[PDB]
């Protein structure tokens, strides 16, 4: 019961700003962005957020809300368990590190 | 039990098309592809979130088509996935897969 | 499964020291990718799937060699890995690592 989760979302590159700015506005700044390819192999954007479990549903809504375009290929959101999180700067561990 | 898993494989870049097409032929199209480095030589990472019962099937496909018989053929990892959500429809569980 | 994935996001200028330090400690199996983090500044992601007993030292190596004393040094995540398969020999479990 770590109560820490990784949110992994694959979205359209043209939806990054709207999804990033919407997340920033909700107080979710800890985010990793990478250029990938998905489903032909079209350029896509992967976003990763390691957060407190209680924040997962809120982030899903924000990602789901902003990323939607109503067309096929909008992307998916994955929830992956995280058993530990550590801050490199102070070696602090746990939910405090998030 | 979640019954949803993430298949994460690091493979040679020259084996991507052959592995991709093999998976598509077997009905596994949902896949994310990213360029990485490993050993620092360039490699290709493929990710598939699938139903648990399909894992063994996909492992076979990747291993059979990514293998060249030399060191560096890559490795396949299975990571638990507790939830999957479809952006277009917000469907969760195996339906979103 | 007693197998775990170590995923660390660090400053790009600390990759070599962390990379070389891990290999010096006997940790050669590692994947490196270029990513962005916060505003959307270049960062480096390093992934290692290892035996659970080795995680702690790897946390130590990454944290001690990636830290600079400034804010934004990065984080280390521990994710469960339920299976590892060697593409070439198709060997699974902790032996495959
Ligand atoms: Cl869709
Ligand atoms: Cl993962």
Numbering used by the authors:
A (entry chain A): -2 to 36, 54 to 112
B (entry chain B): -2 to 36, 55 to 112
C (entry chain C): -1 to 36, 54 to 112
Give me lines lifted from the publication on this model.
MtGlnK1 and MtGlnK2, crystallized without ligands formed crystals belonging to trigonal and orthorhombic forms that diffracted to a resolution of 1.94 and 2.30 Å, respectively. An extra electron density for nucleotides does not exist in the ligand-binding site of the MtGlnK2 apo structure and seems to be replaced by water molecules. However, an additional electron density lies between the modelled GlnK2 trimers composing the asymmetric unit. The resolution limit, the high twinned fraction (0.39) as well as high translational non-crystallography symmetry (56%) and the poorly defined extra electron density restrained us from placing a model that seems to be an MtGlnK2 homodimer.
